[PDB]
Design a protein around this ligand. Structure first.
Ligand SMILES: Nc1ncnc2c1ncn2[C@@H]1O[C@H](COP(=O)(O)OP(=O)(O)O)[C@@H](O)[C@H]1O
Ligand SMILES: Nc1ncnc2c1ncn2[C@@H]1O[C@H](COP(=O)(O)OP(=O)(O)O)[C@@H](O)[C@H]1O
Ligand code: BEF
Ligand code: BEF
Ligand SMILES: [Mg+2]
Ligand SMILES: [Mg+2]
Lengths: 458, 455
RNA sequence: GGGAAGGGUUUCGACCCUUCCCAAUAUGGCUGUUCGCCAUUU
RNA sequence: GGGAAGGGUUUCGACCCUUCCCAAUAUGGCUGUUCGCCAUUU
């Protein structure tokens, strides 16, 4: 049943070694079924489950035709959100370790335009982007989509909907028709699939898992009202006591209100919506990833594509407008063979929305009884996050950040979480008790023989 | 008088009085009204009669100090002439605050040009080589060009610069004003001149043989005896400023080496030296750090050296226009000058072509039966202080630093020239090393600067 | 560029504009006895 | 790019290229116990 990456017999041995080191020991169904047709040059439209590895699936076929000696853009990837753009760019950077000096650049809003322009002079090999800033660079004349080879659209059903299709049509004009086009998504409405064929030539359709074929996700539904949702959420949080929970809302107002309620209650919760600053969005995502926050209250911005390692619980505070969005947001848990729980709240006005979800997945809604009134148990964050002014621009790697952590300041390697290396900064998770001591001792410390400013993400 | 035509702003009229431009020269008074009216002009005038200011004054009335896009372009045959014209234009544009005038020419690194070119300058003085490179790489956008000036157009329009000038015009919009200035105009080039102009008005102030008060003497000598004759004549005239022109670069360097071997303090300017060396040599010779400057035809056009005493045609130029240009380096701005020319038996042809062009009988001189060879010591040396415009070095800064803080008074300090990356200052030879070694501290505008004796 | 402060669009994304504050060996302008003063930009 | 040493074109200009230093949160690539390796460009 298993299929190794060498069965494609077209990847270089360096790429096989890289995949073996990165932990890609066996191909997932999407990769095994789509890669040979992709790297043969076919325009492809691929559907797969949530968390089955479509990102690396198109990234391998993207990298296979990248001339590193050219130093010109020959691969473009389009994402619907900025955080997913960063994540896809990072996964592609890790995959592109068999090609030295492979410059991949991220173009999305929030970031400074001048820095992107100054970095865009040394033309990058691959560009992961959102249509907004990419359309700006194409109009001002900084991105050259001329020697372009592959154009990938991740979560393509969202990129071709009524909202993004106009910006996408504006973008594809700067791209040549003599290109390969890959359209990857987890859900494909037939009304969207019919229109999809306007950016591909004789596309190969690859539906791998059926519409109701989902990863191991147990679902529970609680019947409640609009006012009773917040106390019910607090009760369910104090009942299960999870470590990784994402609460999805339908508006930014509801999102921020639920976050404030869970915080005043005493349960560790951060907020991720489109009204905060992009710095706040990036740092909130980082903090929630490294366990500096128990709950992440987020709108549909964090519903597609995001890969939060070992997410335990998803809570539909309000059912999404479309059932595809429901599938995407419950797919945040049970990623890469894992399992998970997705509990959805249902007010009287949304009982119909839960029925299309029932008919689309062929599942019987496991309506659960709400818990009894109890005093709420607080959910504390296991650790905190330190932000160090450094990043890739300052040539800082996880090895030296960990070295400075267990070197002169004298801490323990077991009290250190994930070290994320961002372009301008580097974030490091440190257990709650040791966090403040580490921050105080690092302000007067030296990393790579240089004193660096550090801030405890309070 | 500059009170006429009622086009110049009141600030510029007061500015001209500050810079010493009291009266209008013939070329200026006859050309400016047609220039700042929008007409394309082709002007011929005396060497050293003010053509630079003539085209620069019209090249500043039609500039928008608010629009930070390019608006003018001047083309020169050499890099030093480009620097000179840029400095002249900056000195004129003191009435328009925050007026950026850039210099695009070879020898300079591409990086400073690329970085300073993102903030588009109002005027660009350039050589066709680097300007074309910037136009191809897409760093200069001539779409908003109002006026295009070509100084010494007969050299810019000959067969050597024909393809380059055409490729540069290719990037320029046709709807533009065009000014073509020169001292000499060969009729064959004047016929073709109309290809970059719209119904051009020809303004020939001075005739082709109407020269400034330059006295010319011709000496009969063999090829071997040229260098001894030069060493004897330099000792005999004992000049303060002398420029010796040669026909090849190796002849130039050899003549310079011989003049140094007889201890007559000569510097060299030719196309095989580093551009840093060329610029520093021109600076040193200008401020009086050398008595003799041996140069090829690179220094034959445009260069304005204040009160040049003597010109020496070691070899007669291949073309008569080049001869007129290289002898016009003396007797500028109403002064007089002397131009001695050696004529070997192999050069009698060109001496007649010259005599036909100027319509004068050649004064063939007889040297003394024998004269010794005296030395020629330079009156002062030059110090190069790092900084320039990066540190926003001002002449007042260098002057106030050299006085008191080191010891020497203002009488021992010569010409101060502020360049982009450095600043050069002339100091008497006696107080030269004392100044250098007391300047090693670094009391130069609160920032210690590396100073060096150019030697 | 880095901090603040707002609007516009807005189911959600992706976006579109406004004001101060400092940083800049980011660029330029200023009288020939210096250590400074103004204008654009990142 | 800051310093150098040259070659080619070579009537003269305007130009083209190479070798050694040096150093750049200039543009990126590289090992979860830090003070580094190398690919461009300036
Ligand atoms: N072949 C594989 N073996 C093991 N892990 C994989 C493999 N492919 C992908 N992964 C990991 O599983 C997760 C899949 O994330 P993702 O690619 O976004 O799934 P999808 O794109 O389908 O939503 C990532 O953490 C990825 O690194
Ligand atoms: N109206 C004027 N009055 C006095 N001096 C002038 C005037 N115009 C120009 N000059 C000076 O006389 C010299 C002429 O330089 P230049 O204009 O290049 O002569 P030309 O262009 O004819 O070869 C320069 O030093 C210039 O500053
Ligand atoms: F389908 Be996964 F969320 F990229
Ligand atoms: F035309 Be002049 F000699 F600069
Ligand atoms: Mg994905
Ligand atoms: Mg002139």
């Amino acid at each position: 049943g298993m299929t190794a990456f060498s069965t494609l017999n077209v990847l270089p041995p360096a790429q096989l070694t890289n995949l073996n080191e990165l932990g890609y020991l066996t191909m997932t169904p999407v990769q095994a079924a789509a890669l040979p047709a992709i790297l043969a040059g076919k325009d492809v439209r691929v559907q797969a489950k949530t968390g089955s590895g479509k990102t690396a699936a198109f990234g391998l076929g993207l990298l296979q035709q990248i001339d590193a000696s050219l130093f010109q853009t020959q691969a473009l990837v389009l994402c619907p959100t900025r955080e997913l753009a960063d994540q896809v760019a990072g996964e592609l950077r890790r995959l592109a370790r068999f090609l030295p000096n492979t410059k991949i650049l991220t173009l999305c809003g929030g970031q400074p335009f001048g820095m992107q322009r100054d970095s865009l002079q040394h033309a990058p090999h691959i560009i992961v982007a959102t249509p907004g800033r990419l359309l700006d660079h194409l109009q001002k004349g900084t991105v050259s989509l001329d020697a372009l080879n592959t154009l990938v659209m991740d979560e393509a059903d969202r990129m071709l909907d009524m909202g993004f299709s106009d910006a996408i049509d504006d973008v594809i004009r700067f791209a040549p028709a003599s290109r390969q086009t890959l359209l990857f998504s987890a859900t494909w409405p037939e009304a969207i699939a019919a229109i999809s064929g306007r950016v591909q030539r004789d596309p190969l359709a690859i539906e791998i898992d059926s519409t109701d074929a989902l990863p191991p996700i147990e679902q529970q539904f609680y019947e409640t009202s609009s006012k009773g949702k917040i106390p019910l959420l607090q009760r369910l949080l104090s009942l299960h006591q999870p470590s990784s929970c994402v609460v999805f809302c339908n508006t930014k107002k509801d999102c921020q209100a639920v976050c404030d309620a869970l915080n005043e209650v005493g349960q560790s919760a951060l907020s991720l919506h489109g009204d905060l600053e992009q710095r706040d969005r990036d740092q909130t995502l980082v903090r929630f990833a490294n366990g500096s926050a128990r709950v992440l209250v987020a709108t549909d911005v964090a519903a597609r594509g995001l890969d939060i390692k070992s997410l335990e619980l998803v809570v539909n505070f309000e059912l999404a407008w479309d059932p595809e969005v429901h599938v995407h947001r419950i797919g945040r848990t049970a990623r890469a063979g894992n399992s998970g729980l997705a509990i959805s709240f249902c007010a009287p006005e949304e009982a119909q929305r839960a029925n299309i979800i029932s008919d689309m997945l062929q599942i019987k809604l496991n309506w659960q009884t709400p818990p009894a009134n109890s005093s709420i148990a607080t959910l504390e964050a296991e650790m905190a996050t330190l932000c160090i002014d450094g990043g890739k621009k300052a040539k800082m790697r996880p090895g030296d950040v960990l070295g400075a952590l267990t070197g002169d300041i004298g801490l323990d390697g077991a009290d250190i979480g994930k070290i994320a290396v961002h372009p301008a900064h580097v974030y490091v998770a440190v257990r709650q008790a040791v966090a403040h001591k580490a921050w105080k001792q690092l302000q007067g410390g030296k990393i790579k023989g240089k004193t660096c400013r550090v801030r405890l993400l309070k």
